[PDB]
Amino acid sequence: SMTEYKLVVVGAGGVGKSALTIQLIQNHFVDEYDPTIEDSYRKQVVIDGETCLLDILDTAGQEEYSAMRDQYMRTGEGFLCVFAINNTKSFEDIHHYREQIKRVKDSEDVPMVLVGNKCDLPSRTVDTKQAQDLARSYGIPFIETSAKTRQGVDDAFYTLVREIRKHKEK
Amino acid sequence: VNPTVFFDIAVDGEPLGRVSFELFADKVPKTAENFRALSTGEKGFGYKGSCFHRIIPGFMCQGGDFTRHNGTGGKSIYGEKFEDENFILKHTGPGILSMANAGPNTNGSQFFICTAKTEWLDGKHVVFGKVKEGMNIVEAMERFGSRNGKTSKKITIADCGQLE
Ligand SMILES: CCn1c(-c2cc(N3CCN(C4CC4)CC3)cnc2[C@H](C)OC)c2c3cc(ccc31)-c1csc(n1)C[C@H](NC(=O)[C@H]1[C@@H]3COC[C@@H]31)C(=O)N1CCC[C@H](N1)C(=O)OCC(C)(C)C2
Ligand SMILES: Nc1nc2c(ncn2[C@@H]2O[C@H](COP(=O)(O)OP(=O)(O)NP(=O)(O)O)[C@@H](O)[C@H]2O)c(=O)[nH]1
Ligand SMILES: [Mg+2]
């Protein structure tokens, strides 16, 4: 059967992890805020001509539970590291998630995509070059997204699968 | 003279039982008054008919979204949100009644009932009451919950009000 990819969506509270995931899976967006405990989703997709199954863990950004991420970082194969382009603190919070992931994997080479979400909003505080530089420094792709307009949503998840493939095909 | 309110709980429309609460108006009068008035429905809206949308065994039962019925809404009698009144009272054990929120100063109508001590919520959620009678009804609600809180039957406040 098709290969399954275990994707994990991480980032600060409110950056749009769930809105991105629900847009990908269910093709809709609501502006209501439903902070996540933990949710899992499945979707089959075609990426670079090859059909596969995305198993997506949508994690809590709720900051008080940072000590409870080890198990899902051990199980996950690739990580969507999400910040919001109008929230500089959420961009600063990226580093700590990547540090946690690198420690669990004991590796600098973990499949990961940096996602700058909410690019539909006019209130930007993180410029594209700043995020591109960080992604380059991490050695990972950077994609700007909007869960509201769907800009970049498929691309961000598909790019993460391409990163997992590159890591598990060498 | 702390007020007392009750919920008559139903499970997919079938009566389960009554839970009653003491509201600590002596320590958190604004927060207690909100919950009291929402329990009577005296503003023309309130808890009657709403559900417990998140039940996590070992931790708490959460409800109070009577505006959207999807866990994102609710409103207080003061406006959609009101400030954290104080954090005098702590989450000391089962039965504690405390305000849900989405960050500082975002109290509305959502609330939770502890089924264990939840001390890591101290200083972030306003404690304002406790179960007085019917704690075993709250305990019976836990088997309709799950790890992430999704419920397997509709747990509703079939009736509610204020006791003498
Ligand atoms: C990391 C997993 N995880 C846990 C958790 C944690 C633990 N521990 C922590 C403590 N350790 C001890 C020190 C050793 C033991 C292990 C174990 N297992 C779990 C769960 C079962 O693993 C899946 C939690 C938890 C809580 C959240 C997110 C993830 C969480 C979370 C998201 S949003 C919120 N919290 C506040 C929320 N806000 C809204 O709903 C806003 C909605 C919109 O605006 C109005 C309305 C709100 O007010 N409440 C009212 C208060 C209880 C609270 N919900 C809630 O549900 O807590 C759930 C839970 C289980 C108590 C905590
Ligand atoms: N304009 C706009 N709003 C967005 C976008 N993505 C999310 N939002 C809004 O931002 C809020 C938070 O989104 P949500 O997906 O719940 O964020 P989260 O990262 O899953 N939060 P948590 O960690 O608490 O689960 C919601 O009001 C949602 O509608 C986006 O791309 N554009
Ligand atoms: Mg979420």
Residue numbers in the entry:
A (entry chain A): 0 to 169
B (entry chain D): 2 to 165
Question: How is this structure described in the published paper?
Answer:
RAS family genes encode small GTPase proteins that regulate cell proliferation in response to growth factor stimuli. Here we describe RMC-7977, a reversible, tri-complex RAS inhibitor with broad-spectrum activity for the active state of both mutant and wild-type KRAS, NRAS and HRAS variants (a RAS(ON) multi-selective inhibitor). The binary CYPA–compound complex then binds to active RAS (with dissociation constant Kd2) to form a tri-complex structure in which CYPA sterically occludes RAS–effector interactions. Although neither RMC-7977 nor CYPA alone exhibited any measurable binding to GMPPNP–KRAS, RMC-7977 makes multiple π–π and hydrophobic contacts with RAS in the switch I (SWI) and SWII region once the tri-complex is formed.
